[PDB]
Design a protein around this ligand. Structure first.
Ligand SMILES: O=S([O-])[O-]
Ligand SMILES: O=S([O-])[O-]
Lengths: 226, 226
């Protein structure tokens, strides 16, 4: 744990269980009933729960765990991860952090991945001995503190523009660079932290695109074989 | 349509509706019943339909449309696509091809994406005027013929090894390079076609990883701005 790795935080993620406010909205009960599960245990998924988000704060961007799924399948199956050059983290829109042991194989199927998330929030670490996934109350600065990185990059549409190629060459110049990708469909970050704001393109991109640009550009810089 | 683009075929994809053989397996009926849908219209998804695949040929690798979903979200939201430098295609394990108009926004949520696939197989092109997705009976060579490419690359674990960086520099040396990524969890290709066999890493990678390596490496070569 002295080699150059990328610490990659999927921040302000729209990954949460059903909000208390709407546990008794019809759509939440009818869904909870069909799925034979206590509503407060269920992961909020706008695709099913839209009719219950109409009146909720930030309701239109919330309950998009899909974004996380695709970002993790991207990160964890990366060559970069296979070479032991990536720690990936998830910080949620409710200031919970998820630590992810590199060797973790996420479910390829979305609905198994959701099943896993429901577990993780219930038990707090899964599975029981291994704790490949572990979750606890934590702000993003508290998390950044733990990492103790020598640079922080905030992937943001309004940042200093870079060719992806070049960002990679930049990340290689540090020992423990953190990069923060928003885990949310649209809008600005909620957590404001210190960090360098970087745009990799002009028009806005989705989290996973950002993830894949960032990881590959480092890969060809940090992986010596390349 | 004279500029350098990458023609990217997701081949031999485990995307099909329920096979005729198992339309009357309990698990298929109970699922079809709950989802109030005629079994033969449903997209085969092993995560739900495993108990019905035990005795089916190739049953253990079949019904993984997830792999396609993640590969398309990767491809279509790529910068490469935004710059009009990518045609993406899907050829299935049942010799059907899906043409995908670049501007297409795939559902981010897996289960909406499945809904769309059920549609596409039913109506044959969706939506009705736009036909952003269009599907017809077609082998892979028949498809490769239509493309009329000046080189064919087959992403394969047992191929000539390349640094991804370098493959990109290679793809740029052609006008209309096709690259073929297997749309299946494991095993060898079913369709055998002419093409150069390329491995980007040693240990095996998932389709999307391959897709993301391939697209980004071309991006930094073909996109002049980069
Ligand atoms: O990872 S499992 O969902 O195929
Ligand atoms: O693309 S829709 O499923 O969010």
């Amino acid at each position: 744990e002295e080699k150059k790795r990328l610490h990659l935080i999927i921040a302000d993620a729209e990954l949460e269980t059903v909000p208390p406010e709407i546990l008794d909205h019809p759509a939440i009960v009818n869904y909870a009933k069909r799925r034979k599960k206590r509503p407060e245990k269920i992961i909020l998924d706008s695709t099913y729960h839209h009719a219950a988000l109409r009146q909720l704060e930030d309701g239109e961007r919330r309950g998009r765990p899909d974004i996380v799924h695709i970002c993790l399948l991207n990160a964890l199956d990366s060559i970069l991860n296979k070479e032991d050059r990536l720690r990936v983290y998830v910080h949620t829109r409710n200031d919970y952090v998820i630590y992810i042991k590199p060797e973790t194989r996420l479910p390829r199927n979305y609905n198994r991945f959701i099943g896993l998330m429901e577990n993780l929030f219930e038990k707090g670490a899964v599975p029981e001995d291994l704790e490949l996934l572990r979750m606890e109350k934590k702000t993003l600065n508290e998390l950044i503190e733990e990492i103790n990185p020598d640079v922080v990059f905030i992937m943001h549409e309004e940042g200093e523009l870079m060719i992806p190629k070049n960002f990679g060459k930049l990340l290689d110049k540090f020992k423990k660079p953190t990069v923060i990708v928003g885990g949310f469909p649209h809008g600005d970050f909620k957590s404001k932290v210190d960090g360098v704001k970087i745009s990799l393109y002009r028009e806005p991109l989705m989290a996973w695109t950002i993830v894949n640009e960032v990881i590959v550009s480092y890969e060809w810089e940090v992986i010596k074989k390349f």
